[PDB]
């Protein structure tokens, strides 16, 4: 501008705001999708459940004894059973609109819980502080997915986009989000790239917390 104002820095600075804007939208609506407290709050807290049941079951087949594994558990963890019964009793009190009593049991629970424990609150916490990780793991791997999915849409068509399988689109999303960027799977569609910047912006920032947390868990098994 120190020269009767520059022409170049006119028709371009507004052409870029037209490109970022796209991403900002794609990005913005991704933080909404995974933000839907009804859509995402169930999809995640569910994906989580299927993580355990489908896990525990495996740690159960590696024992030959299917139910054998089940008893060994209800056994090594005694509280797991009197707790279940409380849950059932609280729930039958609830189902009957008998909340006054529910008020009670819930409290008569805390006591019963404190008592039978002192190194117990640790096992419950270390367990809670455990499902929380499993929660995060979802939320993240979930946002990753979108990117993957989104890249699928605008890439599946074009000739030899490398992004054929829906899985192939996940590989790209994951490799990208981790910043590893192998490269065996790049978009190839000028538009698929516009999106790639958002999947990158998101997937990395998101994957970061994960690794960040997964990296705190490690500095504990090494100490």
């Amino acid at each position: 501008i120190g020269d009767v104002m520059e022409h170049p820095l006119v028709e371009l600075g507004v052409s870029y705001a037209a490109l970022l804007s796209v991403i900002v939208v794609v990005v913005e609506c991704t933080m909404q999708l995974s933000g839907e407290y009804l859509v995402r709050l169930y999809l995640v807290d569910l994906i989580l459940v299927i993580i355990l049941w489908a896990d525990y079951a495996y740690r159960a087949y590696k024992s030959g004894d299917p139910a054998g594994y089940v008893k060994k558990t209800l056994y090594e963890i005694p509280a797991l059973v009197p707790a279940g019964l409380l849950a059932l009793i609280e729930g039958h009190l609830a189902g009957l609109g008998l909340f006054r009593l529910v008020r009670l049991l819930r409290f008569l629970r805390i006591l019963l819980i404190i008592s039978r424990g002192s190194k117990f609150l640790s096992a419950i916490a270390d367990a809670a502080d455990k499902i929380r990780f499993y929660h995060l793991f979802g939320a993240v791997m979930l946002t990753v997915l979108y990117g993957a999915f989104a890249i699928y849409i605008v890439e599946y068509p074009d000739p030899n986009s490398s992004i054929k399988s829906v899985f192939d689109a996940l590989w790209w999303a994951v490799v990208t989000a981790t910043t590893v960027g192998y490269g065996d799977v790049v978009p190839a569609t000028p538009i698929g790239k516009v999106i790639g910047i958002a999947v990158m912006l998101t997937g990395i920032s998101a994957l970061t917390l994960l690794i960040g947390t997964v990296s705190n868990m490690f500095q504990k098994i090494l100490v």
Partner: antibody, heavy 118, light 109 residues
Framework: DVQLQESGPGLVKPSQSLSLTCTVT?????????WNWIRQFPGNKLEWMGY???????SYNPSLKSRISITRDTSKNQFFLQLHSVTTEDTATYSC???????????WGQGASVTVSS | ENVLTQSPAIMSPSPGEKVTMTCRAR???????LHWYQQKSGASPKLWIY???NLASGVPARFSGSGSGTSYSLTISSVEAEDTATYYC?????????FGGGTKLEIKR
């Protein structure tokens, strides 16, 4: 000292999902009692639709059972109602109340009108 | 659908008069699961009497409730203007909750 607030579209086209968002304040929907949806028809009939309680277990009404879906968002302290494919008859005034001991509903929301029409 | 039936349908009492309403169920209902609400014109219902005879909050003692089985009764020791409204009983037996057809009540002036 508490209050729930119906909110959402006041009009829905035949066979489309009717939606509502009750956001309660002054109490937690995850502490106790049942939070249910009650709709009042033009004839001034009152029909309980169903609920979701502090523990998050839903109890719907048989008649709506195949269309209704009460859910909630513990975070923002608000539960919602969803009705698949409403019809001219589903036009009524939906409102959320709080079920207490023996299910007496002590706190009713403002009441939200919802018209189904083209 | 343990249907509740209220009577009368309309009711035109006069200031000072006493008066009673009725709510009868197809099946029987536990006295502690019977409730009454008072819906004033263009407002949502207000809990008026819970568990048959227990008066809800701000409800004045001019009111009262009693009964059991398959027949309950809401009674006003004396009506007053502020009483114009519609009363609905509510029960909980089977899965579905249920309300009566209400009982309008207009005072005579």
């Amino acid at each position: 000292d508490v209050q729930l607030q119906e909110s959402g579209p006041g009009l829905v086209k035949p066979s489309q999902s009717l939606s509502l968002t009750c956001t309660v304040t002054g109490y937690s929907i995850t502490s106790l009692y049942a939070w249910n949806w009650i709709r009042q028809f033009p004839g001034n009939k009152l029909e309980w639709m169903g609920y979701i309680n502090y523990s998050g277990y839903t109890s719907y009404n048989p008649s709506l059972k195949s269309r209704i879906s009460i859910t909630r968002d513990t975070s923002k302290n608000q539960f919602f109602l969803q009705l698949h494919s409403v019809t001219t008859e589903d036009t009524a005034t939906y409102s959320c109340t709080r079920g207490v001991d023996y299910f007496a509903m002590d706190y009713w929301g403002q009441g939200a009108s919802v018209t189904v029409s083209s | 659908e343990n249907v509740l039936t209220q009577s009368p349908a309309i009711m035109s009492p006069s200031p000072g008069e006493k008066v009673t309403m009725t709510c009868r169920a197809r099946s029987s209902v536990s006295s502690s699961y019977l409730h009454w609400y008072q819906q004033k014109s263009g407002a949502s219902p207000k809990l008026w009497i819970y568990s048959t005879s227990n008066l809800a909050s701000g409800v004045p003692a001019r009111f009262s409730g009693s009964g059991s089985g398959t027949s309950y009764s809401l009674t006003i020791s004396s009506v007053e203007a502020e009483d114009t409204a519609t009363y609905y009983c509510q029960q909980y037996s089977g899965n579905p909750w249920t309300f009566g057809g209400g009982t309008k009540l207009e005072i005579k002036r």
